[PDB]
Design a protein around this ligand. Structure first.
Ligand SMILES: CCCNC(=O)[C@H]1O[C@@H](n2cnc3c(N)ncnc32)[C@H](O)[C@@H]1O
Ligand SMILES: [Mg+2]
Length: 209
């Protein structure tokens, strides 16, 4: 089973238009970086709408995970921010196509906000499980991207986790108070329940909307 690593078939280049779009998004939102969270939450909401629709006509749609939620975790020690939804997920092919091929209001309207994650992160990782495929991991530092089968197996059930390796200067997004304030603000009109893993010292999910 060494064919894939030896041939490097897990490696991909972004489409030129995507490189151009990433630069446009990043340069224009430089003074309003916090918008990245609003966009990841919006994308999660869209994914939840999709599986909700599919569940109307597909009786086994929610079998891999019965809930419809967005859950956010701050891992200060590991310098990571996780945004996990139990939406429709993406197959390995969708990770390649949907993320690798193709002003705050416009960005949100055309739904290309995913790329704004690079305003606060040196690396963006997307772990996803779709009913029609096994769990896969997409990763990128914006200069290329790779997609590999998740060696951890099916841990998500169904859904997607966006993991951000935050830039040194973006450490404030690991602060619970900062994240609750933003998540509360950006989840206000989202129809699905959004939670933030927080302490009260005991930890548990805190409903934000
Ligand atoms: C061109 C901008 C980048 N592409 C996306 O955000 C697309 O990738 C997929 N996507 C992004 N976040 C997602 C999520 N949390 N669940 C499912 N699909 C997602 C959707 O098809 C989006 O339209
Ligand atoms: Mg502060």
């Amino acid at each position: 089973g060494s064919h894939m690593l030896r041939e490097k078939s897990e490696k991909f280049a972004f489409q030129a238009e995507v490189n151009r779009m990433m630069k446009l998004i990043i340069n224009s939102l430089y003074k309003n970086k916090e918008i990245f969270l609003r966009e990841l939450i919006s994308n999660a909401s869209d994914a939840l709408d999709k599986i909700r629709l599919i569940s109307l006509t597909d009786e086994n749609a929610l079998a891999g995970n019965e809930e419809l939620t967005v859950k956010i975790k701050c891992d200060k020690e590991k310098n990571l921010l996780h945004v996990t939804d139990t939406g429709v997920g993406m197959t390995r092919e969708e990770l390649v196509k949907n993320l690798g091929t193709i002003t705050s209001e416009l960005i949100g309207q055309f739904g290309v906000g995913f790329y704004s994650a690079f305003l606060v992160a040196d690396k963006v990782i997307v772990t996803s499980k779709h009913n029609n495929d096994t769990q896969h991991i997409w990763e990128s530092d914006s200069n290329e991207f790779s997609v590999i089968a998740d060696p951890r197996g099916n841990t998500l059930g169904r859904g997607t986790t966006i993991t951000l390796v935050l830039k040194e200067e973006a450490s404030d997004y690991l602060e619970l108070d900062t994240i609750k304030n933003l998540v509360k603000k950006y989840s206000q009109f989202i129809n699905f329940p959004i939670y933030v893993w927080s302490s009260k010292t005991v930890w548990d999910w805190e409903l934000m909307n």
